[PDB]
Write a protein that binds this DNA or RNA. Structure first.
Ligand SMILES: [Mg+2]
Ligand SMILES: [Mg+2]
Ligand SMILES: [Mg+2]
Ligand SMILES: [Mg+2]
Ligand SMILES: [Mg+2]
Ligand SMILES: [Mg+2]
Ligand SMILES: [Mg+2]
Ligand SMILES: [Mg+2]
Ligand SMILES: [Mg+2]
Ligand SMILES: [Mg+2]
Ligand SMILES: [Mg+2]
Ligand SMILES: [Mg+2]
Ligand SMILES: [Mg+2]
Ligand SMILES: [Mg+2]
Ligand SMILES: [Mg+2]
Ligand SMILES: [Mg+2]
Ligand SMILES: [Mg+2]
Ligand SMILES: [Mg+2]
Ligand SMILES: [Mg+2]
Ligand SMILES: [Mg+2]
Ligand SMILES: [Mg+2]
Ligand SMILES: [Mg+2]
Ligand SMILES: [Mg+2]
Ligand SMILES: [Mg+2]
Ligand SMILES: [Mg+2]
Lengths: 122, 205, 80, 82, 156, 129
RNA sequence: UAGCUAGUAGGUGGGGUAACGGCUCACCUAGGCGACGAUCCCUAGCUGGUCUGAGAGGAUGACCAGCCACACUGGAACUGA
RNA sequence: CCCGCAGAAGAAGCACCGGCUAACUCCGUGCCAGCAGCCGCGGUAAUACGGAGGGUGCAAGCGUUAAUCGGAAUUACUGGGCGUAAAGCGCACGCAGGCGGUUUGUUAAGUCAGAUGUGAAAUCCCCGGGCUCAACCUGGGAACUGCAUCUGAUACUGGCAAG
């Protein structure tokens, strides 16, 4: 606090870690489904939340949520994952991107279609 | 780009008359001006603070036919310019070419004026201008070219304008169909129902 | 009149050469405290007239050794 | 050697040349010793388009500066016009 | 003549043997624009009653403020519990660039051009209290001249 | 240790104002005398009186108007731990020009306004509002 | 990462450079750097600028321009202004 | 760039609508399916899921993710604190270091003042000008908060000398 003290030893900037460190400051990343499963939510939620453990192109083994009703994913299925946590599931930091490499868009969606990789119905 | 949807809808949502129709027949006859648009129109929820500011901004934008990026740019310009910010913004909006033609009266609506400008009916200083956002300068005469001078719509529009209250800051000749933009309008010349402090606050959120 | 600097002789062991601290009383960029910073310079002195701890005025010159590009002009305040 | 020449600036299809004194080795728009004028070939009427600092140019020539064909032409035009 | 406006209405609990008893507290602030501002808290079992009580309180315990041409007279600090407040005499036409509660109290007071910030806690009740305190603790050039024993021209 | 006499003097003045004491006394110094003179000129105190030969004591007579202190606030600025110097264009305006700032310039200790008029900076000793 | 350095630090004389110089060599002196961070480790081309911010600052160095370094990797010289 | 031809003709989507945050209803499911930036929603009347109608905001774009600054006075020089919220070494001595009562003299290092040189051009800002307008291009200024040198001032701080 004393100016002399500051001169001797200045103030450390508070290094804020990223909450999506497997991306490595990339907006998306490609990966291979190591394992596809359902899991129980955190404390006041009830569900079987769909999630895939994915080995990324840059070495990292993360787990990624799979949003939307129903999915075609299985083991060895290349999907795009993005940034975003599911809160009520512990340790899930990434969503899969629907509508890329090997992940389908949600069926019969008419709203938020861009969010669920759904093409314009005729 | 342009707003292409229902116009009386815009007026109803805002509350005021935005002059989005020619005004031969009154808007109370054209729509339920008191009731808001949609299933839940009669219900009127109480607007907090953000909402009121947003509504004011929407009103002004709708009245003139400026999209958000353009409006924001205009605001930036007003702030940059010396003097009062709201007044500057209003002056710029008025300066717009479509607005000037409408004020002169070579079009029933702002839409009509813009269409004419687009379709190359309007000369600024004897030079065909095509842009509705074209800033007119002081002492600039702007006239209908003869090809658009034969339009019955144009003559009808002139009559309608004659019905309306004529603006002091321009001087327009109906037979010659040319008007001289003598000076940038004063705030006293513009409408009192338009509030600028709300708009300024909104763009200073 | 020539550009010249004053400084204390921190050592004079190496023959024909002295090291001359040139303390300058600079202000700190951020905190505003005035901190004493030092600039040691190896200075050439012929005849080895200077002692350790003295005060000596020096000027810049063509390099006389790997580290020695300053020469002394006059010794002053040579008390012990 | 040192030369006195136009440097291309402006937009696509709308060149505006800054006449600069510069060591010929330097790139056209790169390092330059002194900027001694401008020339605007699409310049409209009631605009000069050209502006040559003649005294500086003369001084540089005396020092030994070669002149681009275009710059020479500009100088000739300026003298006639003025 | 008196412009008045309610800043915040807040729900409070007492927790009795039966269960909880809720009630509403309304903090209002009134002022004449010409300089005079006064805030009032108020508490009641229902919202409208609380606001009315608040209005009465506000109308009483007002305080006069020396305003120079619709803005402050000098940079002023204001303190209270959480509320550390800064307020600056900004140029005519800037408008009031000031937080929520702050904006309300200033507006009713009649300052049209100020730059404020609420540091520390921004708890409405304390920040309004702080702002009013700050406004009072602000003398005019006539007042400073009187205290120091000079003319206003000597002070500038 | 006593490390800042001017600061001590300022503190004494503030405490006197708080406690409604008529006069405040302290060991006199030349800088202190100059500061006192400046304060008197600007009218934040009624008078000062240096008294003694071997170790003289400055006695300031404090100023009251309506029950409250004339010296509303009085803060040290330059201090031994951190000296502050300003240029003539950077000279501060205390309380937007109502209060004064005592600045020690090349031509002696004077108020900020006087220094500004002269066209010279110096050590900003203290603000008074 | 708390000790580092033997052409190391300085001198004399030869040699070398377009040029001063441990640049190089022989001898002489025993120095030189270091808590105002040497040495060692990690990261990084630098600046005008850019973004942001009331400012003070923070982050950054794509495009345009100045400077530096590199040309498969590691060494070397020749020609030549 | 201009002139002529035909005919509304070839040209509107994306997100959101529980609060923060502008915009609400019905149907389907029934802690499931699903949503989510935060807080939260869903266990059979869901304005929070999915569809529909209606509405709101942007618009040739609109959303999501990543990244930097802001808000964050949340590294607090401007601009924080330490009894009980995180924070006074268990207590002392003490070198380097930081700070130094009061008077006079001297110095002018800090400090302050004026001048001179430089601080490339571009960029930013200001008044203009040119592309139909704008973006864009561009003239002239201002600015480049800096650094150096010379000549001054003697309050304060430093040095030196006596008290
Ligand atoms: Mg549950
Ligand atoms: Mg567009
Ligand atoms: Mg802004
Ligand atoms: Mg030798
Ligand atoms: Mg690298
Ligand atoms: Mg800030
Ligand atoms: Mg590149
Ligand atoms: Mg090689
Ligand atoms: Mg050769
Ligand atoms: Mg709402
Ligand atoms: Mg549930
Ligand atoms: Mg949703
Ligand atoms: Mg239902
Ligand atoms: Mg939700
Ligand atoms: Mg839904
Ligand atoms: Mg801070
Ligand atoms: Mg804290
Ligand atoms: Mg505890
Ligand atoms: Mg203790
Ligand atoms: Mg002393
Ligand atoms: Mg000392
Ligand atoms: Mg000096
Ligand atoms: Mg123009
Ligand atoms: Mg420049
Ligand atoms: Mg002294």
């Amino acid at each position: 606090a004393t100016v002399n003290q500051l001169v001797r030893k200045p103030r450390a900037r508070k290094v804020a870690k990223s909450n999506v460190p497997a991306l490595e400051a990339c907006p998306q990343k490609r990966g291979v489904c190591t394992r596809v499963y359902t899991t129980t939510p955190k404390k006041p939620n009830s569900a079987l939340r769909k999630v895939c453990r994915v080995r990324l192109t840059n070495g990292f083994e993360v787990t990624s949520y799979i949003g939307g009703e129903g999915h075609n994913l299985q083991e060895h299925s290349v999907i795009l994952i993005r940034g975003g946590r599911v809160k009520d599931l512990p340790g899930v930091r990434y969503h899969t991107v629907r509508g890329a490499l090997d992940c389908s868009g949600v069926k019969d969606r008419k709203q938020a279609r861009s969010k669920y990789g759904v093409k314009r119905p005729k | 780009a342009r707003y292409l949807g229902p116009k009386l809808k815009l007026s109803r949502r805002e509350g005021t008359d935005l002059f989005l129709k020619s005004g031969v027949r009154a808007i109370d006859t054209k729509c339920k001006i008191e009731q808001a648009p949609g299933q839940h129109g009669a219900r009127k929820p109480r607007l907090s603070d953000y909402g009121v500011q947003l509504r004011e901004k929407q009103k002004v934008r709708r009245i003139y036919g400026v999209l958000e990026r353009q409006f924001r740019n205009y605001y930036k310009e007003a702030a940059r310019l010396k003097g009062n910010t709201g007044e500057n913004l209003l002056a710029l909006l008025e300066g717009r070419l479509d607005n000037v033609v409408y004020r002169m009266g070579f079009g029933a609506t702002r839409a009509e004026a813009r269409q004419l400008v687009s379709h190359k009916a309007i000369m600024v200083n004897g030079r065909v201008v095509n842009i509705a956002s074209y800033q007119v300068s002081p002492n600039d005469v702007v006239s209908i070219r003869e090809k658009a001078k034969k339009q019955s719509r144009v003559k009808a529009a002139l009559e309608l304008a004659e019905q309306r209250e004529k603006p002091t800051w321009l001087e327009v000749d109906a037979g010659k169909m040319e008007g001289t933009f003598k000076r940038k309008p004063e705030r006293s010349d513009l409408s009192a129902d338009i509030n600028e402090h709300l708009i300024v606050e909104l763009y200073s959120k | 009149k020539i550009r010249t600097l004053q400084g204390r002789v921190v050592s004079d062991k190496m023959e024909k050469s002295i090291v001359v601290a040139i303390e300058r009383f600079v202000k700190h960029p951020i905190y505003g405290k005035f901190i004493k910073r030092t600039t040691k310079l190896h200075v050439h002195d012929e005849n080895n007239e200077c002692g350790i701890g003295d005060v000596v005025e020096i000027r810049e010159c063509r390099p006389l050794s790997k580290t020695k590009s300053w020469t002394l002009v006059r010794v002053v305040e040579k008390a012990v | 050697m040192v030369t006195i020449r136009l440097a291309r600036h402006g937009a696509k299809k709308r060149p505006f040349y800054q006449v600069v004194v510069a060591d010929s080795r330097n790139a056209r728009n790169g390092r330059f010793i002194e900027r001694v004028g401008f020339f605007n070939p699409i310049a409209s009427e009631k605009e000069e388009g050209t502006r040559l600092d003649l005294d500086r140019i003369a001084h540089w020539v005396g020092q030994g500066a070669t002149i681009s064909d275009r710059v020479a032409a500009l100088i000739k035009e300026v003298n006639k016009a003025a | 003549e008196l412009q008045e406006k309610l800043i915040a209405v807040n729900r409070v609990s007492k927790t009795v043997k039966g269960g909880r008893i809720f009630s509403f507290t309304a903090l209002t602030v009134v002022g004449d624009g010409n300089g005079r501002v006064g805030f009032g808290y108020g508490k009641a079992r229902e919202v409208p009653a609380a606001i009315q009580k608040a209005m009465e309180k506000a109308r009483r315990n007002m305080i006069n403020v020396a305003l120079n041409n619709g803005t402050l007279q000098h940079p002023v600090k204001g303190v209270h519990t959480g509320s550390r407040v800064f307020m600056q005499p900004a140029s005519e036409g800037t408008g009031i660039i000031a937080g929520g509660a702050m904006r309300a109290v200033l507006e009713v007071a009649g300052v049209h051009n100020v730059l404020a910030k609420a540091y520390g806690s921004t708890n409405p009740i304390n920040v309004v209290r702080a702002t009013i305190d700050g406004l009072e603790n602000m003398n005019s050039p006539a007042m400073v001249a009187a205290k120091r024993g000079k003319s206003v021209e000597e002070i500038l | 240790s006593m490390q800042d006499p001017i600061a001590d003097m300022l503190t004494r003045i503030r405490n006197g104002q708080a406690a409604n004491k008529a006069a405040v006394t302290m060991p006199s110094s030349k800088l202190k005398v100059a500061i006192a003179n400046v304060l008197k000129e600007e009218g934040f105190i009624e008078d000062f009186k240096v008294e003694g030969d071997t170790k003289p004591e400055l006695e300031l007579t404090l100023k009251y108007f309506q029950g409250k202190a004339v010296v509303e606030s009085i803060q040290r600025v330059s201090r031994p731990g951190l000296r502050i110097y300003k240029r003539k264009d950077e000279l501060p305006k205390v309380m937007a020009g109502l209060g004064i700032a005592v600045v020690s310039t090349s031509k002696g200790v004077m108020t900020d306004r006087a220094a500004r008029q002269a066209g010279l900076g110096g050590e900003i000793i203290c603000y008074v509002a």
